From Swiss-Prot, chains A, B:
One of its GO terms (biological process) is symbiont-mediated suppression of host innate immune response. It comes from Vaccinia virus (strain Western Reserve) (VACV). GO terms for molecular function: protein sequestering activity. This is Protein A52. GO terms for cellular component: host cell cytoplasm. Keywords: Host-virus interaction, Inhibition of host innate immune response by virus, Inhibition of host NF-kappa-B by virus, Inhibition of host RLR pathway by virus, Inhibition of host TRAFs by virus, Viral immunoevasion.
Amino acid sequence: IKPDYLEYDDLLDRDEMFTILEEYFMYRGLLGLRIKYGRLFNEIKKFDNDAEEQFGTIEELKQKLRLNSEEGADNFIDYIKVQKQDIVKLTVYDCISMIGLCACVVDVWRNEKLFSRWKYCLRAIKLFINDHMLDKIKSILQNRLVYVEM
Amino acid sequence: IKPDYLEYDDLLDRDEMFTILEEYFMYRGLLGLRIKYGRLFNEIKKFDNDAEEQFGTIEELKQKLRLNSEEGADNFIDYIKVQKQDIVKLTVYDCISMIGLCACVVDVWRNEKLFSRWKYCLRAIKLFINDHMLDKIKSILQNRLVYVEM
């Protein structure tokens, strides 16, 4: 049995980055941010800052993609595919920003009670972030948590 | 990619009983019951009646097992082991009541904001309900859904 990541403070080598992200989008997407997070989820939360910088404000994105419309989730996936298509040399930081964007998007859906749309965040991550990039994100998070400790 | 089960109205061969129950406990444990459910979850919700008849009221269990205490999840698992011990020969209907019991317990934890405890419902199901029994539960649900169509 894997741990629950909601209040988890570490990122061990045996912890699977994809599972962490699944639990992150589940809890953020269903419960929201008025909940205590552990140090792990609190580090992932910091990715929101990167997202806003790379892709713009969530307000602008909400309007551009009509996120709460019937087509909103499909519009978000299309947007992610456009980014994947267009970024010439994808970096781990593009992927970090994309995780943050998914997180800001899942908030819009939660606030609207479109609870099941959190699943699209996972669909988006699988399209955009390969296993090599997941490993790089994992190592970044491990280093940042060590720095927080020390 | 499997469908989302929150608003799902069917139960097909490809839909796995354990995944359905994972999502049921996740959604009920995190969002609660003031949410639109599909026909599938609405049938599973009927298992609450079986639970109360077989195991007693949630108020009795909450007290007996000190569910919201530090030890509450472990007390719940101990209790599941007790029931399995005391049942002479387990039937599909014992397993149905047990699913309803998990559901009624997850409500108590949601209400207390012990949000990660829903995971213990899955541990309980794995201890109590084998794949043979899950198959039988699936058949029963499928039958009940046909009646709802008619």
